[PDB]
Design a protein around this nucleic acid. Structure first.
Ligand SMILES: O=c1ccn([C@@H]2O[C@H](COP(=O)(O)OP(=O)(O)OP(=O)(O)O)[C@@H](O)[C@H]2O)c(=O)[nH]1
Ligand SMILES: [Mg+2]
Ligand SMILES: [Mg+2]
Lengths: 50, 251, 1341, 277
DNA sequence: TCACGTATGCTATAATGTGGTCTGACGCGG
DNA sequence: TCCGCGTCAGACTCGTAATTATAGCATACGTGAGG
RNA sequence: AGUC
């Protein structure tokens, strides 16, 4: 994102900085649910080969 | 099989076999009747459709939908999928003398110990109790030993304490990414329903006590006990097998 | 100006931004939507009206007979919600529909003067929505979640690369109707326009135009601009349009008049263009060589021969030009196609098009959808017209037509549901415009393109399906039957419609068990939006783009509330102020800014409308009753945010809260919390089990009261007035004259729901808030629901918390709790479990519910009464029998041992087994209630009969007290009317009230009032009779049960569960923990004052988590309690009302720029001491979300409590007595006990039952299951050595049948030897492979 | 790319000749006399009728193709028992046969647990009655309400509606997602747990040891009666076949063996302990 | 030889070609 | 080049248990029990 | 519908 968050958590985000935060946060959380699968599929391919 | 409700429940293979038999027998009939060839052909197409559905449904185009709309599970589907029989029932299985509960800290524990709830351990070591009860002659037979455990008599606790002594238990956490996701401990009987984990091994399990749970498994044979104490014990698996560094590290 | 329930306890507000619009009713969506479905509208096609007019009138295939719809009506519900929940039936209204069978003569042309038969037919019961927003389906409360789908209309999308490593962007149009086949247009790498009907095989786009009757020359005239070529004398000329060249390179020397403008081989800039245009250039001389390549527009033929020289859309040459000249054509219309802006796409597509005429095109279309089947002309016209041009099979809907027309830049919103020939061409035109470079692609994730379907639309659709299934049956029977004997009801079937709707409200993915752990859980569940289920996305289909936060989600959808799971991003909580537009788009309120001054004029803007205006931020500073203080205001437009001047500002955010959803609004210092942790915080608040004592939150936001009221779980006063009678069961209020209607008696009765079971087996208990003889207004809380304090929402309990390590007892988020918490029964929770015992009829004979049970101790039978039912109030523990039941066994061929054993005790005990319902193992509770459902024919149990005696007499008492309090309250009014114009005070009280039918006064308005009260009295008199007969019938009614089932006994257990190690607790900043140890009071860190801390949480689980909200909550919580401790001290010493008033006014009016004013004074002394008594257990404070309390305000509040500004205190170790070496942060965190109790999660198994085919042990604690030893877990044993442990796990522990029994016997024999075998799962595998016809033998040694 | 069995078959049927009245009469006379071609042509030409009937009663049990083949069997019986001498048309007579064979097949094959036409016909009347009741009673038919209308036994109506209960798939995963199939919930009932089987082993082993603890003549007429040691479970009177050859002395000695054994269970620690069992 | 569920049989106006979900992705053959 | 088939992590918890429609009656076929 |  071209606009960074100037503020910190002690300062408190404003509505716009918090909303902008959300994107990164949720992509992180979705990553754990969805990508774990490809990581884990690589473990399983490796295990079968060796 | 009959459900309790008086209803029956059956495999989809029965629906696929019935398809095949109906069309096959109808083909025998139409051959006995010397039917015109257009109709014989239709029946031969339909017979091949039914057998192909029975072997591998969905490969030959549009799979035969049963009751909900879902395609009937065919023979190949019971072998093939991850869910088949290989991955589900054979390369891994459900296991006896297995339990689980929420984990919680045991800062007082030594590295080779884990808090195992009384009621959980009572149940896991049932045959081992029955056995000592009969060697002490406190239980006349197995059904009397079972009823003494059901009544949770005071002498039974003392016997259970005696069995668990020097008997290792396997703790497992999902996901098991590397081998240290299973470790053996000597159990410590504790009043209360939560498993107590030694902090220093929390690293290997990636265990944090905000509600994580663990599987408990009892190695039954002398061989399995020894493999747990020598190979899989917490104390003996200090260094990561991945890199040389100690995994058992204060944090 | 505060309400009565607020006078009892006022929350201090640190908010500064005045709220111009109040939080709306939160359960708006569910109610409005369903209300539209059932709502009787004559015109406005909504729900059923629309459904009937759409399908009906249904006329027969012969055309003699037709069935037409008149009107419908919902019968009143057979069973109330209560009886439905107990009995396990759907709460529904019978649908009766008036229908008219009209018949025509075949001999007369269309004579309708034969037979018109009109009657009211039953078509199903429709499930009704509760006033809360739920449906009760088979005795279970369920919520149907609103859906989010792609709005019908047009969409222009493009594979950004993907196909062809060429890396070509292929543009496409998709026309999506509400009902019908999809119409796709797309480009190919070679720039050929293609049509996919119903995403079948590809066809050239021009073919669809031929089917719509377009000649080649007409097609070209539609997409292409014509360029005229005049052939004068010998030189070639062409009619020039000054711009056309524009940004092209001049291939010839361009000469105009006599004078050379362009140089050959140079690029024509703006100067050349304006020079040529101003000179008025219309002919330019050109070389003959330039036409080689130009495309002819029309068919040009030789007027001499009359044969075609060149067909339309043909590439010209020097020889075709020559032939054209000599034939006598000196004007040639050619296509303008200059690459770049004007691409020849349709020209090239016509050359790819194999079809010639209309028929040839219709045949090819017909052959695509129905490949093989020979064309007929009738068939091809019929199919093509029935695709997109039939009113019955195609319907864009109003929203489809509206979004379609706006996408094609039309003026008119409303129009035809069927596609016009002009529609299709306009769509193709826009596609091609986008390819050229003018025009842009629509975005699918944009909320302007995602529409909300709440319930009513979905119930409507399922109901249409039911009707359609009926139409086939109906039309079929109208043609076959004789018309005159046959009435309409013999043709209609109710079971198809009932089945369609039943399957929606019961089988559907969107219909789910309401999440009722707590009020917030309910309210948030009912305002859920799911992109999943039918007509939506799937988890497989769902990418990463849809899941992420879209810019348009601002003010409509919560960015921070979504399941952390596979459903992440598909399921969304609605924002606070958000609402559905008339078409079903989401919209958000905004304050209109006029001439820079910010009005209170409030406009709801849709996703598309929002893009157009510049909207200032809510935090933007307004200047005292006019414009913005600051010159450059921070605003947002075009989906992005920056500074603007004041004149540019159009609008502004209504509240600071509108971005956030309900659940997240309840998080205090959200502003200081990481969005991830905040998400899980809002998610865990839904998991909070209500404690025995519902404790308010000291650090709140203000949404607390809104949520408690709107959830419906609180009893709220409609009429108000003074409370006549309180009871732990009921509240009767006497209404005030101003709202009290002069017709019916003005006494409101609210019956409170006592200790009832939730879906999650939590406890639902309503207690009375107000005291006897309390004056109350409309909208005052009369009774508190389960997790509500005086009107406010109370999900858990606030506690004295200290952040510091203990001896590893708070290691990784592990929680150290004081014994005092357990003693005070805080976080003690109530669970009400419903167990049923079913008496069925088997092939051997009916099962008996006698107390006479083979092989049972007197200890067990003590607790059962005559019938075999446990007594009310009886405490029970695992294995105790609740309802005794025995099942008939067939002739038992016994093992010799059993023959001997049965001979020894002689307890042959007849031909019967023991199938008694007994308490599940380890659960232990008190029996609160018992229900008996019998059928009709079978002789009732003695205990069932005494239960009905109780229900009958109790019913009689209930109804009797209704008529008595209603008659007393009604004559109390007549008494006041009679005094009006007839003083008889003492004289009227002496004669009996029963003989007051004679009493009147003079004929005025007051005599008419007496008539109203007298007609009501008698109405209530008969009403009481028919009510009592209904109750009596339902109590006697052998309810109709499942086939096979003779009777059912439902036992309700009440369990009190104590907090304990393993139980899961969290705060509201997503900060979880499992309790590790309960510490004695002596051991816990204590203050200088000697007061021990309740909970010791680990400091190290804050800076990593970046939820700083919990720390601010703790500092403010201590400050709140500081002031409560001062008020508690002043109340203990009585002191002066004047002095308390002083302190409390200075307190409420503390904050730097406090919005909330509290001019204490006006409060009467009695109001003030009731207020102080509530403020004593800590002054409750509200920190709005994004407009919260500042650190400086919190430190100022702490100074008012004489607590430290650091909010750190000196602590002393309970054990040693010595001080901790540095100050510790202590204060009050509001904590929650989640549903995850160790009691329910702890499970263990040695040996049990085993699976049917695979012979492996079952899964799950309910089935007494073994833990799954997965691939992952196996690999661990493989990495180690452990080969015996692995084999054990594979063989004697799972399948190996012989092995497991043998090894069990060995372990009791103490041999600890395995003796392995072959896993039965493998034996199955073999059999399954041989069933495939593969020989899989096992070669022996 | 015509691959579908149905579309192929319907293509083949369309390619047939449509018969007239006089043509039907000519072919029908030759057909009954036993013409090969006449039978084939009448069947092939009238396949169209089967389809317009099998497609009519669709989504009721079997699939169109399956409903078309069985319907074709009706066509054959129709051509076999057609009377060309009667002026009345073939289509009229055939419609009966095609509907009959389709309905009969749909009544048998459709239900996994096979149901007799007699019960099916009874069921039909119960269901039609339920429909008329539902139209006037806004609620649905009770078993007793249906029984009252037909003047039949409540028990008989209940038995019938029980047989209507259609079958739940075991292989079908239930938990919304493919989480767990019903198979894995439902345990093997006929198979005892290792706990129960081991308990029977203990009793059996104990019996052998209990037989060599009482009198030699007290465990020779007690076990040989119950069939514990002996081969066949005899009665008091039948123990006479061995060596006992008594009726009174066998009954006194059987009970004498059990009385001494009752005190062996009171002392070991069972009797009333193992009475609950 | 009947009792009882099951099965086969015939009805004769004419009628004669069928009719749910629609969007994953990145790899690797044929 | 385009269609087809193949993979996509690992356990755990709950909760519930549906719908349709096939006419109506007379002789024919099989087994067991009673006279 | 959830829990790691
Ligand atoms: O979706 C999930 C979540 C968690 N887990 C497993 O459970 C563990 C606990 O999941 P947590 O959410 O507690 O994460 P964490 O301990 O890694 O980090 P904190 O937020 O607590 O600081 C994870 O580390 C992983 O091993 C999963 O397997 N899947
Ligand atoms: Mg964690
Ligand atoms: Mg965790």
């Amino acid at each position: 994102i071209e606009t960074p968050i100037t503020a910190n958590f002690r300062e408190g985000l404003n509505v716009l900085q918090y909303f902008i935060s959300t994107h990164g946060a949720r992509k992180g959380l979705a990553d754990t649910a969805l990508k774990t699968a490809n990581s884990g599929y690589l473990t399983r391919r490796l295990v079968d080969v060796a | 099989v009959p459900l309790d409700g008086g209803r029956f429940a059956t495999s989809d293979l029965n629906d696929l076999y019935r398809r095949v038999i109906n069309r096959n027998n109808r083909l025998k009939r139409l051959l006995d009747l010397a039917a015109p060839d257009i109709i014989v052909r239709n029946e031969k197409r339909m017979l091949q459709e039914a057998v192909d559905a029975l072997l591998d449904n969905g490969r030959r185009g549009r799979a035969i939908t049963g009751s909900n709309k879902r395609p009937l599970k065919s023979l190949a589907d019971m072998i093939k999928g991850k869910q088949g029989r290989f991955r589900q029932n054979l390369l891994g299985k459900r296991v006896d003398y297995s339990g689980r509960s929420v984990i919680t800290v045991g800062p007082y524990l030594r590295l080779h110990q884990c808090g195992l709830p009384k009621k959980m351990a009572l149940e896991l070591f049932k045959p081992f109790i029955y056995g000592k009860l009969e060697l002490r002659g406190l239980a006349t037979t197995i059904k009397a030993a079972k009823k003494m455990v059901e009544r949770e008599e005071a002498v039974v606790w003392d016997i259970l304490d005696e069995v668990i002594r020097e008997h290792p238990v396997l703790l497992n956490r999902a996901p098991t990414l590397h081998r240290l996701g299973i470790q053996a401990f000597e159990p410590v009987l504790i009043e209360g329903k939560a498993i107590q984990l030694h902090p220093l091994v929390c690293a290997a399990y990636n265990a944090d006590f905000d509600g994580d749970q663990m599987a408990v498994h009892v190695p039954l044979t002398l061989e399995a006990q020894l493999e747990a104490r020598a190979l899989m014990m917490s104390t003996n698996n200090i260094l990561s097998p991945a890199n040389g560094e100690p995994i058992i590290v204060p944090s | 100006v505060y309400s009565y329930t607020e006078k009892k306890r006022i929350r201090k507000d640190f908010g500064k931004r005045p709220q111009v619009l109040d939080v709306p009713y939160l359960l708006s969506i569910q109610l409005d939507s369903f209300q539209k479905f059932i709502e009787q509208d004559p015109e406005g096609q909504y729900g059923l009206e629309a459904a009937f007019r759409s399908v009906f009138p249904i006329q027969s295939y012969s055309g003699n007979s037709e069935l037409q719809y008149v009107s419908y009506r919902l019968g009143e519900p057979v069973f109330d919600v209560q009886e439905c929940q107990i009995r396990g039936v759907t709460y529904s209204a019978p649908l009766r529909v008036k229908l008219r069978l009209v018949i025509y003569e075949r001999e007369a042309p269309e004579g309708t003067v034969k037979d018109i038969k009109e009657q009211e037919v039953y078509m199903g019961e429709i499930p009704l929505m509760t006033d809360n927003g739920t449906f009760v389906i088979n005795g279970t409360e369920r919520v149907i979640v609103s859906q989010l789908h792609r709005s019908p209309g047009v969409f222009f999308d493009s594979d950004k690369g993907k196909t062809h490593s060429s890396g070509k962007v292929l543009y496409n149009a998709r026309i999506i109707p509400y009902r019908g086949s999809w119409l796709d247009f797309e480009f190919d790498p070679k720039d050929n326009l293609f049509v996919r009907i119903d995403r079948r095989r590809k066809l050239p786009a021009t073919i669809i135009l031929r089917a719509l009757n377009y000649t080649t020359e007409q097609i070209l005239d539609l997409f292409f601009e014509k360029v005229i070529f005049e052939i004068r004398d010998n030189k070639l000329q062409m009619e020039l349009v000054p711009e056309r060249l524009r940004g092209e390179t001049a291939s010839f020397d361009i000469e105009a008049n006599g004078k050379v403008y362009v140089e050959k081989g140079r690029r024509i800039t703006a100067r050349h263009i304006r020079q040529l245009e101003k000179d008025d250039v219309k002919l330019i001389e050109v070389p003959v060589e330039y036409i080689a390549g130009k495309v002819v527009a029309k068919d040009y033929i030789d007027e001499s021969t009359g044969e075609l020289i060149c067909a339309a859309n043909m590439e010209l040459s020097l020889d075709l030009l020559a032939k054209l000249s000599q034939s006598g054509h000196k004007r040639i219309e050619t296509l303008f196609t200059n690459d770049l802006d004007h691409g020849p796409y349709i020209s090239e597509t016509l050359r790819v098009d194999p079809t010639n005429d209309r028929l040839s095109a219709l045949v090819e279309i017909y052959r695509m959808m129905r490949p093989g089947e020979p064309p007929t002309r009738e068939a091809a016209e019929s199919l093509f017209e029935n695709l997109f041009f039939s009113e019955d099979r195609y319907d864009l809907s109003a929203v489809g037509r509206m979004k379609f027309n706006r996408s094609l830049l039309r003026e008119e919103i409303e129009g035809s549901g069927i596609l016009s020939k002009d529609d299709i061409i306009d769509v193709m035109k826009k596609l091609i415009d986008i390819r050229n470079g003018k025009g842009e692609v629509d975005d699918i994730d944009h909320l302007g393109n995602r529409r909300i379907r709440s319930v009513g639309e979905m119930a409507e659709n399922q109901f249409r399906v039911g009707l359609v299934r009926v139409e086939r049956a109906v039309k079929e029977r109208l043609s076959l039957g004789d018309l005159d004997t046959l009435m309409p009801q013999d043709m209609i079937n109710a079971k198809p419609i009932s089945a369609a709707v039943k399957e929606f409200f019961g089988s559907s993915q969107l219909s789910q068990f309401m999440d009722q752990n707590n009020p917030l859980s309910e309210i948030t569940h009912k305002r859920r939006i799911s992109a999943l289920g039918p007509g939506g996305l799937t988890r497989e289909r769902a990418g990463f783009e849809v899941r992420d936060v879209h810019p348009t989600h601002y003010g409509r959808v919560c960015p921070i509330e979504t399941p952390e799971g596979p459903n992440i991003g598909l399921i969304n909580s609605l924002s606070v102020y958000a609402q559905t537009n008339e078409y079903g788009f989401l919209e958000t309120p905004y304050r209109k800014v006029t001439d820079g001054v910010v009005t209170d004029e409030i406009h709801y803007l849709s996703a598309i409308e929002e893009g157009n205006y510049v909207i200032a931020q809510a935090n933007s500073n307004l200047d005292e009753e006019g414009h913005f203080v600051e010159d450059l205001v921070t605003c947002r437009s075009k989906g992005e945010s920056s500074l603007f001047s004041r004149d540019q500002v159009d609008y502004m955010d209504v509240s600071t809260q509108q971005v956030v959803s309900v659940g997240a609004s309840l998080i205090p210092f959200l502003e200081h919390d990481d969005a991830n942790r905040a998400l899980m915080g809002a998610n865990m608040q839904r998991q909070a089990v209500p404690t025995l004592r519902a404790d308010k939150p000291l650090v709140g936001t203000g949404m607390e009261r809104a949520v408690a009221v709107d959830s419906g779980v609180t009893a709220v006063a409609k009429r108000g007035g003074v409370v006549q009678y309180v009871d732990a069961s009921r509240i009767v209020i006497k209404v005030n004259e101003d709202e009290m209607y002069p017709g019916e008696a003005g006494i409101d009765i609210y019956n409170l729901t006592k200790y009832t079971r939730s879906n999650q087996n939590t406890c639902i208990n309503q207690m009375p808030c107000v005291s006897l003889g309390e004056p109350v207004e409309r909208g005052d809380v009369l009774a508190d629901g389960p997790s509500t304090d005086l009107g406010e929402l109370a999900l858990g309990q606030n506690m004295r918390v200290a952040f510091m390590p203990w001896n590893g007892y708070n290691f990784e988020d592990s929680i150290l709790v004081s014994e005092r918490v357990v003693q005070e029964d805080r976080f003690t929770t109530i669970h009400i479990q419903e167990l049923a015992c079913v008496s069925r009829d088997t092939k051997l004979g009916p099962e008996e519910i006698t107390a006479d049970i083979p092989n049972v101790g007197e200890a067990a039978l003590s607790k059962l009464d005559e019938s075999g039912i446990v007594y009310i109030g009886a405490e029970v523990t695992g294995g105790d029998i609740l309802v005794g039941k025995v099942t008939p066994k067939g002739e038992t061929q016994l093992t010799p041992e059993e023959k001997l054993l049965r001979a020894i005790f002689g307890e042959k005990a007849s031909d019967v087994k023991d199938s008694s319902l007994r308490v599940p193992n380890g659960v232990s509770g008190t029996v609160i209630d018992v229900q008996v459902f019998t059928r009709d024919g079978v002789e009732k149990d003695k205990r069932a009969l005494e239960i009905e005696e109780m229900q009958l007499k109790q019913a009689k008492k209930d109804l009797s007290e209704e008529l008595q309090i209603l008659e007393a309250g009604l004559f109390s009014r007549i008494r006041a009317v009679l005094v009006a114009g007839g003083v008889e005070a003492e004289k009227l009280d002496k004669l009996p009230r029963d003989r007051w039918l004679e009493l009147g006064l003079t004929d005025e308005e007051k005599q008419n009032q007496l008539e109203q009260l007298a007609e009501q009295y008698d109405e209530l008199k008969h009403e009481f009779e028919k009510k009592l007969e209904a109750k009596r019938r339902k109590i006697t009614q052998g309810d109709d049960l499942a086939p096979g089932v003779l009777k059912i006994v439902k036992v309700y257990l009440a369990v009190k569960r104590r907090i304990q190690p393993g139980d899961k607790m969290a705060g509201r900043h997503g900060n979880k923990g499992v309790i590790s140890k309960i510490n004695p009071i002596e051991d816990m860190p204590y203050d200088e004052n000697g007061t021990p801390v309740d909970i010791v949480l680990n400091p190290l689980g804050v800076p990593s988590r970046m939820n700083i909200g919990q720390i601010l909550e703790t500092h403010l919580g201590m400050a709140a309690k500081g002031i409560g401790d001062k008020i508690n001290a002043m109340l203990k010493q009585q002191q002066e009302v004047a002095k308390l008033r002083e302190f409390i006014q200075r307190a409420y009016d503390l904050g730097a720029d406090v919005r909330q004013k509290v001019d204490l004074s006006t409060f009467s002394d009695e109001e003030v001491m009731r207020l102080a008594e509530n403020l004593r257990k800590g002054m409750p404070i509200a920190t709005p979300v994004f407009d919260g309390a500042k650190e400086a305000e919190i430190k100022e509040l702490l100074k008012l409590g004489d607590l430290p500004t650091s909010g750190q205190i000196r602590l002393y170790d309970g054990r040693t007595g010595e001080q901790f070496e540095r100050p510790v942060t202590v204060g009050y965190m509001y904590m929650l006990k989640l549903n995850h109790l160790v009691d329910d999660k702890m499970h263990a198994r040695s040996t049990g039952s085993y699976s049917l085919v695979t012979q492996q042990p079952l899964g799950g604690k309910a089935q007494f299951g073994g833990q799954r030893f997965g691939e992952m877990e196996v690999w661990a044993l493989e990495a180690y050595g452990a080969a015996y442990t692995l084999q054990e796990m594979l063989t004697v522990k799972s399948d190996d049948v012989n092995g497991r029994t043998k090894m069990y016997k060995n372990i009791v024999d103490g041999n600890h030897q395995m003796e392995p075998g072959m896993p039965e799962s493998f034996n199955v595998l073999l059999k399954e492979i041989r069933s495939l016809g593969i020989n899989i033998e096992l070669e022996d040694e | 790319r015509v691959l579908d069995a149905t579309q192929l078959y319907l293509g083949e049927i369309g390619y047939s000749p449509l018969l007239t009245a006089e043509e039907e009469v000519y072919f029908a006379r030759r057909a009954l006399r036993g013409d090969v071609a006449s039978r084939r042509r009448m069947i092939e030409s009238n396949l169209r009728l089967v389809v317009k009937i099998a497609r009519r009663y669709g989504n009721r049990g079997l699939a169109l193709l399956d409903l078309i083949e069985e319907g074709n069997l009706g066509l054959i019986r129709a051509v076999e028992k057609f009377d060309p001498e009667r002026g009345f048309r073939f289509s009229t007579y055939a419609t009966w046969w095609i509907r009959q064979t389709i309905e009969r097949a749909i009544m048998n094959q459709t239900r996994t647990i096979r149901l007799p036409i007699h019960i099916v016909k009874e069921l039909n009347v119960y269901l039609r009655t339920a429909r008329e009741l539902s139209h006037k009673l806004d609620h649905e038919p009770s078993a007793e309400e249906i029984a009252e209308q037909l003047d039949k036994p409540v028990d008989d109506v209940s038995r019938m509606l029980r047989l209507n209960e259609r079958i739940t798939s075991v292989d079908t995963p239930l938990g919304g997602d493919s989480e767990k199939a019903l198979l894995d919930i439902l345990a093997d009932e006929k198979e005892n747990g290792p706990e129960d089987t081991t308990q029977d082993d203990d009793m059996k082993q104990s019996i052998v040891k209990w037989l060599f603890e009482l009198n030699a003549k007290q465990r020779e007429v007690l076990a040989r009666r119950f069939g514990l040691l002996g081969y066949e479970a005899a009665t008091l009177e039948d123990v006479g076949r061995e060596i006992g050859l008594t009726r009174e002395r066998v009954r006194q000695i059987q009970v004498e063996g059990l009385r001494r054994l009752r005190e062996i269970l009171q002392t070991q620690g069972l009797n009333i302990e193992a009475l609950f069992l």
